[PDB]
Design an enzyme around this catalytic site. Structure first.
Site, PDB file in Angstrom:
ATOM      1  N   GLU A  47      39.432  43.728  35.075  1.00 28.69           N
ATOM      2  CA  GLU A  47      39.452  42.239  35.857  1.00 28.69           C
ATOM      3  C   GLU A  47      40.598  41.565  35.749  1.00 28.69           C
ATOM      4  O   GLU A  47      40.272  40.344  34.969  1.00 28.69           O
ATOM      5  CB  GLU A  47      37.943  41.446  35.445  1.00 28.69           C
ATOM      6  CG  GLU A  47      37.694  40.491  36.237  1.00 28.69           C
ATOM      7  CD  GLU A  47      36.432  39.753  35.885  1.00 28.69           C
ATOM      8  OE1 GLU A  47      35.827  40.370  35.235  1.00 28.69           O
ATOM      9  OE2 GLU A  47      36.174  38.647  36.308  1.00 28.69           O
ATOM     10  N   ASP A  48      41.657  42.021  35.899  1.00 23.35           N
ATOM     11  CA  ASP A  48      42.971  41.233  35.706  1.00 23.35           C
ATOM     12  C   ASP A  48      43.363  40.788  34.276  1.00 23.35           C
ATOM     13  O   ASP A  48      44.007  39.967  34.069  1.00 23.35           O
ATOM     14  CB  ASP A  48      43.161  40.096  36.746  1.00 23.35           C
ATOM     15  CG  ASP A  48      43.087  40.509  37.944  1.00 23.35           C
ATOM     16  OD1 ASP A  48      43.699  41.572  38.503  1.00 23.35           O
ATOM     17  OD2 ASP A  48      42.589  39.671  38.924  1.00 23.35           O
ATOM     18  N   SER A  49      42.985  41.507  33.268  1.00 23.14           N
ATOM     19  CA  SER A  49      43.206  41.398  32.134  1.00 23.14           C
ATOM     20  C   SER A  49      43.895  42.573  31.343  1.00 23.14           C
ATOM     21  O   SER A  49      44.054  44.004  31.671  1.00 23.14           O
ATOM     22  CB  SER A  49      41.784  41.213  30.894  1.00 23.14           C
ATOM     23  OG  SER A  49      41.078  42.379  31.247  1.00 23.14           O
TER      24      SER A  49
ATOM     25  N   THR B 252      46.166  38.119  33.303  1.00 21.73           N
ATOM     26  CA  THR B 252      45.899  37.316  32.166  1.00 21.73           C
ATOM     27  C   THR B 252      46.089  38.377  31.007  1.00 21.73           C
ATOM     28  O   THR B 252      45.573  39.515  31.212  1.00 21.73           O
ATOM     29  CB  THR B 252      45.090  36.303  31.837  1.00 21.73           C
ATOM     30  OG1 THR B 252      44.025  36.744  32.203  1.00 21.73           O
ATOM     31  CG2 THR B 252      45.455  35.037  33.227  1.00 21.73           C
TER      32      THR B 252
END
Ligand SMILES: [Mg+2]
Ligand SMILES: [Zn+2]
Ligand SMILES: [Zn+2]
Ligand SMILES: [Zn+2]
Ligand SMILES: [Zn+2]
Lengths: 113, 51, 1157, 66, 51, 45
Positions: C781-783, C924
């Site tokens: 999830e975009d990490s 991120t």
RNA sequence: GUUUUCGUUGUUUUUU
């Protein structure tokens, strides 16, 4: 501005102990050992060493959270040996293994160069 | 440049500046005879993967 | 001569930028501004006459002022103590000054009493920082080494009050073109033939005309045509205005309209127009007809009515054609043909006019924008001479003439337009365009460069539409097709392409001569029978001749533009199908340099390039073998400028492969046109490189052509906001924000236009090691998962700098506040922050460890009346830490000390920090893990960062894989890898080389679980990639508020993370809570967490009309004399406001604590 | 600007090679063999020196206040 | 005192990264194990620079 | 105590609250507060 | 001395 600190990963606070054993009556001759200030390095080693012990009937550990240098290890042994006693035996066995490792390494290092 | 410095005992665990090593190579079973890795392949497993 | 390869094309582009560069359009625009534009704007009405007709016997005492030459001065800033010095831009920035220079004029006088030189200061003009009259123009680099300017900082902007403002060029429709549109069916108008007929020179609006077609088919009577001329109050029939404009017989009207006499339908369709205009049978009645509706005054009578109608048919009607006498016949012919085009478009025999094709549009640069604004301001300059030489002419005093010239006339309009952003006058705040000038961004170096090459379409969301936002085929190779803003401005605010140049404006008269050189047939000669198939010729949109043998003239114009006698940018277009021809030299038409494939089939070079390896070698010399610059290639006829309007009439080869018309089974190559039925292809041109269809930002991405276009657009958007190193002398600049990377790294994957961009010298990002897997589960999830060792060593460590500006102020003339250390006695209403850091002058010393709740600049302000001083200091931002980088002490323009304190901080990545790749791959940090816990390679090598595999199925970034592969190959081989789009590189060969590198061809490699050292079952694709740090951090958004400051009016928590803002609870959140059954929760959110006041209202009138006093325990309803029937109400203060304005609007909202029933 | 003291990806002492690297560059020498001469074996260490961008020379050619 | 054109955090962190010849770092006491206030030599080696 | 340094002429000096912003010898109105000689301690990590 | 004191218009750019 909220992240935790770094020296605490091995420095023992006054209130919590390095070793907190509680009885795991879930299966007979089982306990749950909380090692603060620890991680996979010692945990997996002790786990394998105990797994090599015939008395040890259950052996497992888990680093409950990677963001905290700590882990908890559940150890059940046969009706003969206690989990704690199996733990000292495993530690001492790895002691002697490390002695032999260091000795052989040093000897062949000296003869090598 | 006028600087004074204080060096204290430390380990790689607290900073890579105290790190005794850059990287340590650790290997075993040089032919996957113990079957610890799949040898993912498009055509064949032994030939796609070196020695 | 030989074949043209890609590196030769790169050398061509090297010539292009070594002569032009990328600011050439702006430089030449502003130079044209103060070399042709300013002088013309000054002398556009060079005659100022006054008189005293009476006696002095009888006399015309003629005060007559004649205008003359302007004067330009070198920048000099003239300190406020007479210590005048020539101004340097560095000093201007330090003291917050304007890069502006004084100008002067010669308004000589000529006295003509009849019986019947002087140098004044016009004003101070802000100057673009790389014009020819800039302070540091002749000065060399070593001089620049003494004045501390960034050599890569490439000017192109304006400096005003220490703020750098750039004038954004504004794209607008090109005038003087027929625009026939399909009007809505439920309307009397069917087709609107529009032309913005305005003077080509200056490109300024004079007037426009829209001819509307009435009626329907079998409905609405005949197909009558009545258009509203400029400043008339009725739609007058077109045949009538033809009578009024000179040609009263209708056959002349058709000879002006009818040009395919073989058609009967148009004759029978114009019959109703003849019937309705039949009431008008001469020029006199037609002109009176126009004048009656001409919006003129009353009592003008038929004579002056006809005269005014004739003037308005003459002036402001086709003013771009003529405003004087003699060409009203040309007016008749042009209006006739324009009506004919309207009718043909109405019949749908032609495709309806397109509304996006750039050929009908231009771009107003800084040059013509400043020209228009100066026109405005000077038109309010020439007149204040009249409005003062009248109050003194009656006294006939010895007028100084240096006091009637209010020189700040042209200072304030430009100051307000460039500062506030509204191009006009502050009085006319309404109907003003906002955004044409904006603060230059120096967040990164590209935040300037790309910032200096925008374009904008100022239409507005009046009607949403997708046409202003949607990419069009005509945008190919002319603009960057991936750089767009976010939602509100997405699609709009468009960028150029790489090789573009804008027409600076050449005189049209040379083009007129070039065209008339070929035996032009006048518009009067244009006849339906004679010129049944002849070519109608237009200039800049004005129709200026006919011809029957157009092939020779178009060939000569093409070859002559190849030569250079025609300005190489002048557009030549030949509408063969519609028997027409058109030349465009107006400012704003954008051209790209096309390699000139021989189009005249008379040689083997037909299907090949006139430019050959001889020209390539000459350019590689940098000079000529007896100079060979870029203009040498352009004027040699081997490369020529082309516009979009020309482009749609030319057929262009993509790559050097398909130049010669050609006559297996590789899955790593692209596709050219099939050439199956069309066995032949004579491409008139070829691009220097297809990779030049890109933009300045787009020239960064490694293989942007292997990834999804939406992700390409996301890359374009994020590239400007990616962290990096902007300027070499960042330190001497006192900017709101400055970011400098600890260790800039040139990307492993590179383009070739990169070489021109000097990205080795100002690189944005670092080459860090990434492996692909799902090891920690935190990568979702975009990490991303980070190596802590690299962070400790300082990977993507950076330096941030924040400049606080402070100044003393003048309350009166002597009443001044001072920068001094506040104390408990002299200073009242202190602040809890520690003032101790201040030493003597309210200034902290450079190098002190500053933090929040600590005053950095102490200021004390007088109290209006012994102990009359208040703290007016500006402490450091609360949640900000660091060490003072620099302290600048100067004054203002006149007399007040102005301090600029820049503080320095070191930024280090932490969980949640935002980053992105060069492939749209944004996320991120999810968690950071140390070296020992993450798995290692066979050589014990761990990655710097870990990403989510789930991006590939979803986001589908193949180019990222190619980049990582090339990165591994380059790092092993030790060289810079190329990733230029539209090249011949093949991934399979790279895999073979990786095999040669002794590594797995597909990049896989066994990881060994860091916790156990056990061989992870899969072999992990693991290697370097070039990533970029992004402006968004985690700790700048962390913000909690239990209770803080409240807004002065609402008595509710303030908004804004700066001032301890509260969370604005949206209405949908209210609705979802209501659906959640959250009564008490939402109530306390509106009661205790929001406004809550208790009041005492009446029980008779039911209003808050009660004098209330809790301590007195008195509650008297002055409205109803009610004291015992008074009730206390604990309700939101906003309710009190609502009740208040309801009362104020003479509405009585009688609150009642009871039920009427 | 300035090569890292310690290798980001690996952690090897790399800082005292820059002048040596330039020395190797001067003799019209290939890059990879020169890096190998610099004991740069791990391609992480290799591209760290290969792709480092030092920037102080423009900064230093500014005449400082003192 | 520093008159260079680089940040002091930059040079400080780089100095930390510098390995020091440490065959006897075991004998060094930790900054927390050593009981002395501030730094003593036994738990702290002093370096100097002046250029 | 409060020392001041000129723009590029390298003039070192000290203004008080009695004079305008003017480098005393060069006549340079872009002056800079001279850095503090005081030591600043860092963590080197 | 418990306690204890900043704001708006307009403009631009932004953020899943
Ligand atoms: Mg979001
Ligand atoms: Zn009442
Ligand atoms: Zn390395
Ligand atoms: Zn000690
Ligand atoms: Zn001086």
């Amino acid at each position: 501005m909220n992240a935790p600190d770094r020296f605490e990963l091995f420095i023992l606070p006054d209130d919590v102990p390095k070793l907190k054993i509680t009885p795991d009556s879930r299966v007979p001759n089982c306990i749950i050992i909380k090692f603060e200030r620890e991680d996979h390095t010692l945990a997996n080693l002790l786990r394998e060493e105990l797994a090599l012990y015939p008395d040890v009937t259950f052996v497992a550990y888990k680093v409950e959270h990677p963001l905290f240098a700590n882990f908890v290890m559940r150890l059940q042994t046969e009706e003969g040996t206690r989990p704690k006693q199996a733990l000292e035996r495993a530690c001492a066995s790895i002691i002697n293994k490390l002695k032999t490792l260091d000795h052989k390494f040093n000897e062949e290092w000296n003869i090598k160069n | 440049l006028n600087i004074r410095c204080i060096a204290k005992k430390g380990i790689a665990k607290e900073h890579a500046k105290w790190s005794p090593c850059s990287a340590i190579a650790f290997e075993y079973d040089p032919h996957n005879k113990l079957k610890h890795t799949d040898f993912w392949f498009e055509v064949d497993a032994k030939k796609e993967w070196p020695d | 001569d030989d074949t043209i390869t890609t590196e030769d094309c790169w050398t061509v582009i090297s010539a292009f930028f070594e002569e032009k560069g990328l600011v050439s359009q702006q430089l030449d625009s502003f130079d044209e501004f103060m070399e042709t534009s300013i002088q013309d704007l000054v002398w556009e009405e060079p005659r100022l006459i006054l008189d005293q007709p009476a006696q002095h016997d009888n006399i015309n005492k003629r005060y007559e002022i004649r205008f003359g030459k302007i004067y330009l001065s070198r920048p000099t800033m003239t300190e406020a103590d007479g210590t005048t010095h020539a101004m340097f831009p560095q000093e201007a920035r330090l003291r917050n000054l304007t890069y502006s220079s004084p100008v002067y004029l010669d308004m000589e006088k000529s006295m003509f009493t009849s019986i019947d030189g002087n140098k004044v200061h016009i004003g101070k003009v802000p100057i673009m920082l790389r014009s020819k009259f800039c302070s540091l123009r002749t000065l060399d680099e070593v001089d620049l080494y003494k004045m501390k300017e960034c050599p890569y900082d490439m000017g192109g902007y304006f400096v005003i009050n220490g703020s750098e403002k750039v004038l954004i060029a504004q794209e607008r429709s090109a005038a003087n073109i027929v625009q026939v549109f399909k009007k809505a069916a439920p309307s009397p108008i069917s087709h609107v033939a529009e032309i913005r007929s305005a003077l080509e020179k200056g490109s300024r609006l004079i007037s426009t005309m829209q001819i509307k077609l009435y009626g329907r088919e079998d409905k609405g009577t005949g197909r009558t045509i009545k258009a509203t001329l400029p400043y008339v109050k009725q739609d007058i029939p077109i045949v009538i205005v033809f009578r009024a404009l000179g040609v009263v017989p209708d056959g002349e009207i058709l000879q002006h309209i009818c040009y395919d006499e073989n058609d009967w339908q148009m004759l029978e369709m114009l019959k109703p127009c003849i019937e309705e205009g039949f009431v008008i049978q001469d020029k006199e009645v037609a002109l009176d007809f126009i004048g009656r509706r001409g919006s003129a005054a009353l009592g003008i009578r038929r004579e002056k009515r006809i005269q005014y109608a004739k003037d308005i048919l003459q002036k402001e009607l086709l003013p771009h054609i003529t405003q004087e006498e003699g060409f009203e016949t040309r007016k008749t012919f042009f209006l006739g043909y324009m009506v004919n085009r309207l009718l043909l478009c109405a019949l749908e025999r032609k495709d309806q006019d397109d509304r996006d094709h750039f050929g009908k549009k231009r771009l107003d640069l800084a040059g013509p924008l400043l020209a228009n604004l100066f026109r405005i301001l000077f038109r309010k300059l020439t007149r204040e001479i009249y409005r003062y030489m009248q109050r003194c002419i009656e006294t006939d005093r010895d007028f100084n003439l240096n006091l009637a010239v209010k020189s700040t006339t042209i200072t304030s309009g430009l100051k307000y337009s460039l500062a506030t952003g509204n191009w006009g006058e502050q009085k006319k705040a309404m109907s003003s365009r906002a955004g044409v000038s904006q603060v230059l961004n120096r967040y990164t170096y590209s935040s300037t460069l790309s910032h200096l090459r925008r374009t904008n379409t100022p239409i507005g969301r009046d009607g949403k539409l997708a046409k202003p936002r949607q990419l069009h085929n005509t945008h190919w190779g002319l603009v960057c097709p991936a750089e767009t803003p976010e939602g509100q401005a997405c699609g709009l605010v468009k960028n150029l392409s790489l090789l573009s140049g804008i027409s600076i404006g050449s005189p049209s008269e040379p083009i007129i001569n070039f065209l008339e050189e070929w035996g032009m047939e006048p518009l009067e000669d244009y006849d339906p029978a004679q010129h049944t198939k002849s070519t109608r010729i237009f200039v800049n949109g004005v129709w200026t001749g006919i011809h029957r043998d157009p092939s020779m003239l178009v060939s000569t114009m093409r070859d002559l533009r190849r030569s250079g006698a025609i300005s190489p940018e002048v557009s030549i277009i030949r509408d063969i199908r519609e028997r027409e021809f058109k030349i465009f030299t107006d400012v704003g038409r954008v051209y790209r340099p096309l390699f000139i494939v021989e189009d005249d089939e008379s040689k083997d070079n037909k299907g090949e390039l006139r430019i050959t390896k001889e020209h390539i070698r000459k350019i590689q010399q940098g000079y000529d073998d007896d100079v060979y610059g870029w203009s040498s290639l352009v004027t040699s006829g081997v490369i020529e400028y082309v516009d979009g309007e020309e482009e749609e009439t030319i057929m262009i080869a993509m790559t050097p492969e398909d130049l010669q018309t050609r006559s297996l089974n590789d899955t790593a190559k692209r596709i050219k046109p099939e050439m199956s039925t069309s066995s032949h292809h004579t491409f008139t041109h070829c691009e220097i490189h297809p990779s030049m269809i890109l933009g300045v930002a787009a020239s960064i991405i490694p293989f942007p052509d292997h990834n999804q276009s939406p992700r390409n657009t996301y890359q374009s958007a994020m590239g400007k906001q990616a962290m990096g190193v902007f300027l070499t002398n960042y330190n001497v600049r006192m900017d709101t924000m400055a970011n400098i990377l600890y260790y800039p790294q040139k990307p492993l994957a590179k383009t070739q236009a990169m070489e021109y961009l000097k990205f080795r010298e100002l690189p944005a990002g670092q080459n860090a090691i990434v492996a692909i897997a799902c090891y920690s589960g935190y990568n979702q999830e975009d990490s991303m998962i980070m190596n802590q060792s690299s962070i400790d060593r300082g990977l993507f460590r950076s330096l941030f700098f924040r400049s606080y500006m402070d100044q003393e102020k003048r309350f009166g003339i002597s009443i001044v506040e001072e920068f001094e250390k506040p104390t408990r006695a002299t200073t009242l209403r202190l602040k809890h922050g520690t003032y101790e850091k201040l030493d003597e002058d309210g200034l902290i010393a450079p190098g002190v460890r500053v933090s929040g709740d600590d005053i950095i600049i102490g200021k004390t302000t007088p109290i209006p009346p012994y102990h009359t001083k208040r703290d007016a200091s500006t402490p450091l931002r609360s949640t900000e830490n660091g060490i003072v980088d620099q302290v600048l002490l100067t004054t203002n323009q006149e007399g007040l000390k102005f301090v600029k304190v820049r503080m320095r901080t070191t930024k280090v990545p932490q969980i949640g920090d935002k980053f992105a790749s060069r492939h749209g791959q944004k996320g991120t940090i999810g968690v950071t893990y140390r070296h020992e816990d993450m798995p290692f390679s066979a050589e014990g090598i761990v990655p710097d960062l870990i990403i989510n595999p789930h991006a590939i199925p979803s986001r589908m970034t193949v180019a990222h894989l190619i980049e990582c592969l090339l990165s591994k190959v380059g790092s092993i081989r030790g060289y810079e890898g190329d990733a230029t789009p539209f090249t011949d590189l093949t991934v399979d060969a790279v895999s073979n080389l990786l095999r040669d590198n002794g590594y797995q061809s597909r990049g896989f490699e066994v990881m060994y679980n860091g916790h156990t050292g056990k061989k992870l079952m899969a072999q992990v694709f693991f290697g370097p990639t070039y990533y970029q740090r992004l402006r968004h951090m985690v700790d700048d958004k962390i913000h909690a508020r239990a209770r803080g400051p409240v807004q002065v009016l609402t008595r509710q928590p303030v908004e804004g993370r700066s001032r301890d803002g509260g969370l604005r609870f949206g209405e949908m959140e209210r609705d979802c809570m209501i659906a959640h059954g959250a009564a008490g929760f939402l109530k306390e959110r509106l009661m205790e967490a929001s406004d809550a006041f208790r009041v005492h209202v009446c029980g008779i009138c039911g209003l808050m009309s009660v004098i209330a006093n809790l301590k007195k325990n008195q509650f008297e309803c002055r409205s109803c004399k009610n004291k015992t029937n008074i009730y206390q109400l604990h309700i939101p203060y906003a309710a009190k406001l609502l009740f208040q304005e309801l009362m104020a609007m003479n509405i009585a909202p009688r609150l009642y604590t009871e039920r009427s029933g | 600007m300035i090569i890292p003291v310690r290798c980001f990806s690996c952690g090897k002492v790399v800082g005292d090679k820059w002048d040596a690297y330039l020395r190797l560059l001067e003799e019209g020498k290939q890059e990879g063999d020169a890096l190998d001469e610099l004991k740069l074996k791990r391609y992480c260490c290799r591209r760290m020196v290969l792709t480092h961008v030092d920037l102080i020379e423009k900064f230093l050619r500014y005449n400082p206040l003192e | 005192m520093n008159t260079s054109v680089l940040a002091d955090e930059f040079i400080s962190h780089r100095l930390g990264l510098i390995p020091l010849v440490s065959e006897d770092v075991e004998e060094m006491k930790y900054s927390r194990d050593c009981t002395c206030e501030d730094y003593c030599d036994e738990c702290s080696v002093v370096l100097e620079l002046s250029a | 105590g409060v020392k001041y340094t000129c723009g590029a002429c390298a003039h070192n000096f000290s203004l008080n609250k009695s004079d305008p912003v003017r480098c005393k010898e060069c006549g340079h109105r872009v002056i800079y507060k001279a850095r503090t000689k005081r030591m600043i301690q860092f963590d080197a990590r």
